[PDB]
Symmetry: D2
Subunit: 286 residues, 4 copies
């Protein structure tokens, strides 16, 4: 079905990205008490990294074809993408909202319980929205792999033509409804994320400020989703191209998001440790 060379290349790239995510997770857990890591949100960074792992896993699953049960495979690979995107992007919006609310306090500080509940609601409520949409899609209009043989007798204003096509595709009866819903909810939450990124545009440094990561992420996500919807819909007779493009889009988006989140943490951690070592040796020498 799919060429072994493309499968090997995609598997290698996905495994390398997964190893990078594991290294970031190890850095976050081990250096959790460090000032550079602590001034970030390591507990939210964990959720982002689990979402990244889910996205890479779904990218792996996209390569299985003509093996399985196929309806459940498509349903679970797509649900994994949706939940992974929610888990990747919710924490970043929560961090931006926290940074915005910290630096715009007033006399009516409200209550810390309400602030914590709103922070939890900018993540868990989004995840629950995706969960209920996926449950409604699965229970109401599940993906069905059906084969149609059909003869079509179309006619234009003056020309008559006849076609006879047989195809084997897996999709829902009302697939565009669920597409418009999930695309729509993600787009509204990402518009609010862009608003939050703008509101906190120059409020702190890239390790704490998350405006650039949000903007790059939303733009890349819109581009990748727009491309992949179209190529999956129309270039269904190009299995290698569709698989490679889907894996590449998922890989690029996840890797760019995580690199933008974590590379500055590593840079400032190295700088802080170098400063500490310099002062330690200067004190020891004297």
């Amino acid at each position: 079905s799919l060429s072994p060379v493309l499968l090997g290349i995609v598997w290698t790239f996905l495994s390398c990205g997964l190893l990078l995510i594991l290294f970031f997770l190890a850095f976050t857990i081990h250096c959790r008490k460090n000032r550079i890591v602590k001034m970030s949100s390591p507990n939210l960074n964990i959720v982002t990294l689990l979402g990244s792992c889910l996205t890479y896993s779904s990218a792996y699953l996209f390569g299985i074809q003509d093996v399985l049960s196929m309806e459940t495979l498509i349903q679970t690979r797509l649900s994994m993408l949706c939940i992974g995107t929610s888990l990747v992007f919710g924490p970043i919006l929560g961090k931006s909202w926290r940074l915005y609310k910290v630096f715009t306090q007033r006399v009516p500080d409200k209550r810390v319980i309400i602030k914590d509940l709103q922070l939890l609601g900018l993540v868990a409520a989004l995840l629950m929205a995706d969960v209920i949409l996926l449950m409604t899609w699965v229970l109401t209009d599940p993906i069905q792999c059906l084969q149609i043989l059909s003869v079509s007798m179309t006619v234009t204003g003056k020309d008559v033509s006849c076609t006879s096509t047989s195809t084997h595709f897996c999709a829902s009866r009302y697939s565009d409804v669920w597409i418009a819903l999930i695309w729509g909810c993600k787009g509204l939450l990402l518009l609010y994320g862009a608003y939050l990124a703008g509101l906190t545009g120059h409020v702190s440094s890239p390790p704490v400020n998350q405006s650039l990561t949000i903007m790059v992420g939303v733009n890349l996500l819109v581009l990748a989703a727009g491309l992949l919807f179209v190529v999956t819909r129309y270039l269904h007779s190009w299995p290698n191209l569709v698989f490679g493009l889907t894996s590449g889009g998922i890989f690029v988006c996840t890797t760019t998001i995580n690199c933008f989140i974590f590379i500055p943490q590593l840079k400032q951690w190295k700088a802080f440790e170098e400063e500490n070592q310099t002062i330690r040796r200067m004190a020891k020498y004297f």
Copy 2:
């Protein structure tokens, strides 16, 4: 197939919206030199007014069936969709330009010419996409009658459907292109609205207008995409929903732009009258 009552109600609502648009245009052209109107960029508002009237015109065009005088339904669909696209571009360009100017003035301080040039570039992108859509494949209407046997691996069903629709061969690709470029524009507009957050008063600060407009645009566009895709056997429902969405979005955006200007103008003039006496 369109009920006269729905047509009458929709026409009256769109006419009232157009009269509101013309009132705002007269207000912003007559009272150009006033401080309240002048500080809100009266020249850039003309483009928004023209885009709004173009969108209302497209909403009118959505309500006629068959042919005008022996004409082509293809041309009607193409022209109303392109009118809607150009109108939304012209509505949302000036607001983003005003927000960008406010941001740049706030941060290490832009004439109207540069903003109009950026809006013109946006319009050129939309025009290029519309032109390549029209030339690469038109929206030709086809009569599709066919018989298909469905084999799910457990049951066999035969159906005979005679369907007529006006669409492109690859219509989802053009949908993806137009929606995607508009969505990138809206993402940058939301970023700009956040950047100019609580930077001035609402007459000068066009930040709530952007956030209301982008959300209304996304919601209406998704709803109407789905409804047109699937509920094509409900011409009255499709027409009413499309006209209602266009009217609601355009009127909300224009009111959010112009009600602060009008009330601040009234307050300023009343204060001047009190001072003079």
Copy 3:
């Protein structure tokens, strides 16, 4: 020459102020690790409370009259200068750190080093004041014949005062350096204006403190210079000005922390009550 009643009232007020300062010190030492206290730089608040203690001690020292007197006056004036520098340094450091983290991002050691340089400026000025010319007390008796060009008047005055030969130069120096510091502090308070909550944003406290500081310094300079034949008035006004300024600044620093802490632990207690109920 000072009434016992005024002495007792002033000492009771200063002792209550010291008790309040010690209560704030206990609160900020015990509740070091709390979020509300930790986000308000508990290490830089110790320096402010120490400076407040020095200022209250100098206010106490202002009330003893007879017994050398030069060492007493120099001691209390230098204590006041050191205490006010220690009070106002940490607030400026906190505002500077808030500005730096807000504007494209500072350890406590760097801020304490800046405060140490600020203190060293005052130490240098006080040392050169004490060594160049001390505050020796002289009994001056003289006969003066005034000729204004239209009338002739004669007066004989026997006056005693403790001052330096060039006292206004040292005044203008100390006042000038403190005023430059206060102007930069007001600039910092403006920069970090409506940037965070009161316990973190030390902006109203800076403005109130500098305004009260200028007012009290001007009033007490004039009163000491001219109303020297009113010992009770001078003592009461000096002690009251010191007490009012110090107490106002420290209350503005610490009362927001106390109420936010009370709200925080009230919320925690409600959470624990809900957990126990289920």
Copy 4:
């Protein structure tokens, strides 16, 4: 009395500064409708320049000595001119900063003129109270003082003639105090508008430089006037130099960016005009 060379040099420098103020006034009035000038506050800049003129005029008066043998009113008017000139220089800048802060924090020249009118009325009532209650008197006193320490005794013979007020330090502390409170609020305003716009519109740097230079100059000149009355040339030169430096620095910081951004605008206009002529 005073050396002719120092008098000539000080008069030359003050005249050059006054001509610079006149040039700035001509530029402000002539190009009052220009966009760069209009987005500034030319009506308030006129008040600043008039205050600068008063401050430059008082420096000339500080050089008149041993001529009006009349000397009390000369000192009173030269000092009142300084106080009013400082008020008129610094009030408009604070008003511009406050207007900029209020425009960009929302939920007009007449109002700012009223505010600076109140600011000047404060100085007017202080100066009137000083003149009416405790005016300057030029008095000559001869006296002998028997200074005795704890163990040492000495006698001195002093005969001096100085023009000063009886409670001079009271009025000093008052005027210094009110000015210092206004300068503290001005520094607060400069902080509030720290990075709100460009230097032509933003006035934070000019405010901070002005308040620092003003405090430093006033502190120096108080001490040298008090303790170096036997150095007439030194005190005259230092007072004139401080006044000149403060006024010139403040006015340059206000107006040089306007000239820069006006010349750049005119150059752009000329370039586009030439391009239009080409096509």
